[PDB]
C-alpha cells in the first residue's frame, strides 16, 4: 500500500495509517495465498521420500 496507494508521499501515507488496518489484512491475505501455492505443489509432486 505504501507504494501502490500512495506515491511514496509522506502526506498521503499519513492519511493511509488514518484508515487503520485495511492494509495489514491485504498483506496478510496475500501472504496466505503465497504460502498456499508453495504448499499446493508439495502434495501434487512431493509424494516420494
Amino acid at each position: 500500500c505504501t507504494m501502490y496507494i500512495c506515491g511514496d508521499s509522506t502526506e498521503c501515507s499519513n492519511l493511509l495509517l488514518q484508515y487503520g488496518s485495511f492494509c495489514t489484512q491485504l498483506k496478510r491475505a496475500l501472504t496466505g495465498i503465497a504460502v498456499e501455492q508453495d504448499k499446493n505443489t508439495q502434495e501434487v509432486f512431493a509424494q516420494v521420500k
Partner: protein, 49 residues
C-alpha cells in the same frame, strides 16, 4: 519483525516487514530560458478597465 508482528517472541520463519527504497541525491528544477517579465502587471497600474 517483532514490531510488525506485534509481539516479543517471533517464531521461526520468514516475514515480510517493509521495503527497501533509496532516496534522491539532489533536487532538479528545469525551466525554459525565457523569463520576460509578464505585462499583466501593467493591468494593475491601469485605471479604466
Amino acid at each position: 519483525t517483532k514490531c510488525t508482528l506485534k509481539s516479543f517472541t517471533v517464531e521461526k520463519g520468514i516475514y515480510q516487514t517493509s521495503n527497501f527504497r533509496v532516496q534522491p541525491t539532489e533536487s532538479i528544477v528545469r525551466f525554459p530560458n525565457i523569463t520576460n517579465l509578464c505585462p499583466f502587471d501593467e493591468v494593475f497600474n491601469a485605471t479604466r478597465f
